[PDB]
Amino acid sequence: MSKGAELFTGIVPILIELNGDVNGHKFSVSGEGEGDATYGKLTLKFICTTGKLPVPWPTLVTTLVQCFSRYPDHMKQHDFFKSAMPEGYIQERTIFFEDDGNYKSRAEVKFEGDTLVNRIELTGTDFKEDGNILGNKMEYNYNAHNVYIMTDKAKNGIKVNFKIRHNIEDGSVQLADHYQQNTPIGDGPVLLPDNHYLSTQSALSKDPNEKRDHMIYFEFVTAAAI
Amino acid sequence: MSKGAELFTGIVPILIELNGDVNGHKFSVSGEGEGDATYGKLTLKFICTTGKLPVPWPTLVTTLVQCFSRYPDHMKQHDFFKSAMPEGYIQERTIFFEDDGNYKSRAEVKFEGDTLVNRIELTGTDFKEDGNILGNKMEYNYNAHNVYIMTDKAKNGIKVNFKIRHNIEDGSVQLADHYQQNTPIGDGPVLLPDNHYLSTQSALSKDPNEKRDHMIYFEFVTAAAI
């Protein structure tokens, strides 16, 4: 039945499941929401299901479904992420926090029934006990970023690079350098893109009636040439 | 709390009208949408009614209703903006773009019937034709910022300061230094706040089916103690 970008023409439910271990602190996060790739929008709510998150919510934003990007008409032949569905893709990252520790993640993003599911394993290491991460000095907010994409022909996939700017409580900015690769899970045809980028913007919020450690997350993402 | 704050317990329709003249290039913008102060959320659509906008949409974001900020229960005594309603307030700014020109604006924000209305006059001068504003070199996106508020006792109102970070197409960032004053229109008592700030986050988007020059704008804002 439906395949590739066909799976994204309406509103699609989303489920995110993360198991993390950072500097030995183990934790899990579950998210649910929906995505609307026609407008490049999604909304998610995340709960730390193991109690208190041991790292700031903003550090996990990138780890916690780029298949919901709006690709303008002229760029449809360059949308790798939807082309891999429903069987999906593996997304692996290494993330370095400036003057501090690193995250390493591996995720499978694929359809399970009618839901787009992102299941992730993450390990963090080398963090300073009173750095911005373990010391909880990051502002609860997020900025706009460009996500650069190119074909990785040997893996029949893509390589992705960008840097996140995290606002720190003292008015400084800490960079988190991201290195990412995506490879299809299935063996069917996928679209291997010309070099381009995703213009990504987000906002983090809270439900003042929710008592659990949580994050309400809004994202707007559109692909663009160059 | 304040009497005016009770006007914001639901979803309030918004109308925005702006006339601008930047280096002699004149334009008007009309906006409509709704605000939800309980969650600190705004959604607005803006249309350049004079045709094509001669400056980047991002430069107009701050000019184009901080009465929609979520003030947590323990900070409701510091919400000047809602307290001045429904009579409203005058909001004046000067905005200095780094190594470039300045905007000056004067707005009246008040209720007209059921609708919160923001009507603004904006003048921009001294811009470089090859700078990021007149040369239209700003990316179509927006970042998170802290908006710092303090009482201006002599004016029975508040002074507000913040620096916006505008992402530029070459990867640089251009600051826009905002200086702002708000003064009640009405005679009623208003809340004069302790020093605090608004955590503000935004995202700019497009409706692919809208052919007029326009901006779909989403904002999330919550007051926080210093």
Q: The CATH number of the domain where B99 resides is what?
A: 2.40.155.10
Contact A100, A131 (CB under 8 A): yes
d(CA B191, CA B183): 12
d(CA B59, CA B61): 6
Residue B190's domain comprises 1-226
Here the tokens at position A113 are 């029934």
Q: Give the rounded distance of the alpha carbon of B182 from its chain centre.
A: 12
The amino acid at B15: L
A 10 A CB-CB count for A71 gives 25
Counts of helices then strands in chain A (DSSP H, E):
1, 11
**Which one of B72, B142, B146 has the shortest CB-CB distance to A201?**
B142
Q: How far B210 CA lies from chain A's nearest CA (Å)?
A: 12
Give Dmax over CA atoms of chain A in angstroms.
Answer: 53
Q: Which of B41, B43, B143, B166 to mutate to test the interface with A (most CBs of A within 10 A)?
A: B143
d(CA B16, CA A95): 42
Three-state DSSP state, A4: helix
Q: What is the resolution of this structure in A?
A: 1.8
Q: Do A40 and B205 touch (CB under 8 A)?
A: yes
Angle at B188 between CA B183 and CA B194, to 5 degrees: 55
Q: Do B199 and A139 touch (CB under 8 A)?
A: yes
The amino acid at A192: L
User: CB within 8 A of A42, min separation 6: which ones?
Assistant: A14, A33, A34, A35, A36, A65, A68, A218, A219, A221
d(CA A73, CA A95): 32
A 10 A CB-CB count for A160 gives 21
The amino acid at A147: V
Which residues in chain B are closer than 8 Å to A218, comparing Cβ atoms?
A: 203, 218, 220
Contact A93, A164 (CB under 8 A): no
Which residues in chain A are closer than 8 Å to B197, comparing Cβ atoms?
A: none
Residue B198 to residues A60, A107, B8, B160, B218, Cα–Cα distance (Å) = 23, 35, 17, 10, 16
**Which one of B38, B70, B141 has the shortest CB-CB distance to A201?**
B141
Which residues in chain B are closer than 8 Å to A140, comparing Cβ atoms?
A: 199
Q: How far B13 CA lies from chain A's nearest CA (Å)?
A: 22
Into how many domains does chain B fold? Answer: 1
Q: Do A220 and B205 touch (CB under 8 A)?
A: yes
- CA dihedral sign, ordered B92, B182, B203, B37: negative
Phi, psi of A17 (to 5 degrees): -135, 125
Here the tokens at position B206 are 């497009």
d(CA A112, CA A86): 8
Contact A105, A63 (CB under 8 A): yes
Angle at B62 between CA B59 and CA B65, to 5 degrees: 150
